[PDB]
Amino acid sequence: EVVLVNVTENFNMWKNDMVEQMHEDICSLWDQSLKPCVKLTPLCVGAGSCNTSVITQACPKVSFEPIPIHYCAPAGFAILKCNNKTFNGTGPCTNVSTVQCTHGIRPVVSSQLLLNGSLAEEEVVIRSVNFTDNAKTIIVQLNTSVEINCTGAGHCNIARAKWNNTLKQIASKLREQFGNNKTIIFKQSSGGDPEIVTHWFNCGGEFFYCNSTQLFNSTWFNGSDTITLPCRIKQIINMWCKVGKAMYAPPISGQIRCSSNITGLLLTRDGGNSNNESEIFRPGGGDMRDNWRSELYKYKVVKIE
């Protein structure tokens, strides 16, 4: 909207109230939009014997279809946008402007792979609040999209050549960060909830759990046409907004089909005092705030008058 001449501004994408607002907004859209047949949430207020809260309600089958949302300044505030093409997300931004609203952000809820988002303008970008801390998520932003085509018949397809090319570019970025003498290894999820261990997303209103092992099984700096991931549509789901469980009715459509563009990844690295010269990276995700961060990293909200 208007580029602030000769202004330097500090950003911190890891402490951004815009992310918190978007998180609460998306959580609300889901409550009012998706209705489970049964939902369970815990209640163990240190009283001893727990009391699970159980809600049972009409369970209509509805195709969910994420619509771009724009965030404009809240009353009394302004939105500053960083213009540095390859901004890491945390630090001084020299080329900053004021905008009326953010760009249109599709609120896609998923684990492991970020879908239908924004691409990096120059090279692949990796971001973390602390690269030294193995417990912190690493957000990967691709500069080229990879198609992933999924069907309710139980699989997803990805071009092996394209995926190979993107892995190479991600690994190059990772050793640029952790050591240019490092073998970069990709492995499957270590474990946890099903929504965490598989690439989890929604398509045609249904929850897909696709095994991503074939995507994360390679070593860098050390049949073959399409990668076909085995998929499962599930009815009993762990809630992402709060701790709890939701149950949905089985599918009613015989033709569930989605094609998405992979535009980023959520990764975690294996820590450890292993003085080996290799870093192990596994697909991660689960905190949807990281999904929103991947789009909001270039914005901050500042008090005006």
Epitope: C37, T52, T56, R232, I236, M247
Partner: antibody, heavy 128, light 110 residues
Framework: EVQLVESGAEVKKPGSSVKVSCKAS????????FTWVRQAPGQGLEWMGR????????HYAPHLQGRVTITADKSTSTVYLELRNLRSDDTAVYFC?????????????????????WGQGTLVTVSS | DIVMTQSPATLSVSPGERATLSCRAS??????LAWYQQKPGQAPRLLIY???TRATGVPARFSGSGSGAEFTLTISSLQSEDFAVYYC???????????FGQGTRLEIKR
């Protein structure tokens, strides 16, 4: 396949409570939902309620809501029906029934409302 | 509050002939309709679910049809062991309030 074996006949005074049980064996307990159905002498079948075993969540017929409780003990693969404040008209044969729901432990659940497997029935007589 | 009605209350059929049983719902139940057979002193036995799917162990002479609010159970040729009481069951609503018809008694005509 699951085999359902129920507890023995009960005789109660009006106002008493009763707890009948149903032992399910032969398959994986949490992959089944269990339903209680009663039949008064000379009458037809009446659905009382159904427990989604994996969720530990039961739903009851409206005319019974409040005085019926269905539970499941996963450790002993046993389903229980408790009926409170018994009335003479609660005299009936009480059947435990069940159906396979899919790989519930892997989050697959068809929520089937029909009843494939049946216990032998328990006579509950409520009389002064 | 879905009421299931079966007709007729009693059907008399000569051995080896066809029998057709009817079940009506007070509102649509889609295809969430099951049929049970019950003999005196025994538990009910599932014959048909999803309106037209034969349960395991059920002979081919039993056939279910219909959808919405109107259903039929057909027995192609009655054997000695088919004479029983037959019940229909609606399981379409959620939260679940499942209901049964009052049964059709199939008797031997002589």
């Amino acid at each position: 396949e699951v085999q359902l074996v129920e507890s023995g006949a009960e005789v109660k005074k009006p106002g008493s409570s009763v707890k009948v049980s149903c032992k399910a064996s032969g398959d994986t307990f949490i992959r089944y939902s269990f339903t209680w159905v009663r039949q008064a002498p000379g009458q037809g079948l009446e659905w009382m309620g159904r427990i989604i075993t994996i969720l530990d969540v039961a739903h009851y017929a409206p005319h019974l809501q409040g005085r019926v409780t269905i539970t499941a003990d996963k450790s002993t693969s046993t389903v229980y029906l408790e009926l409170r404040n018994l009335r003479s008209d609660d005299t009936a044969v009480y059947f435990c029934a069940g159906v396979y729901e899919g790989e519930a432990d892997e989050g697959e659940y068809d929520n089937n409302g029909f009843l494939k497997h049946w216990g032998q029935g328990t006579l509950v007589t409520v009389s002064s | 509050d879905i009421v299931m009605t079966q007709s007729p209350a009693t059907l008399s059929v000569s051995p080896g002939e066809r029998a057709t049983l009817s079940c009506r719902a007070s509102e649509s139940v889609s295809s969430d309709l099951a049929w049970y057979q019950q003999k005196p002193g025994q538990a009910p036995r599932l014959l048909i679910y999803g309106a037209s799917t034969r349960a395991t162990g059920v002979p081919a002479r039993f056939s279910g049809s219909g959808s919405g609010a109107e259903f039929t159970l057909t027995i192609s040729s009655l054997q000695s062991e088919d004479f029983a009481v037959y019940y229909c069951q609606q399981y379409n609503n959620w939260p679940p309030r499942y209901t049964f018809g009052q049964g059709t008694r199939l008797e031997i005509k002589r």
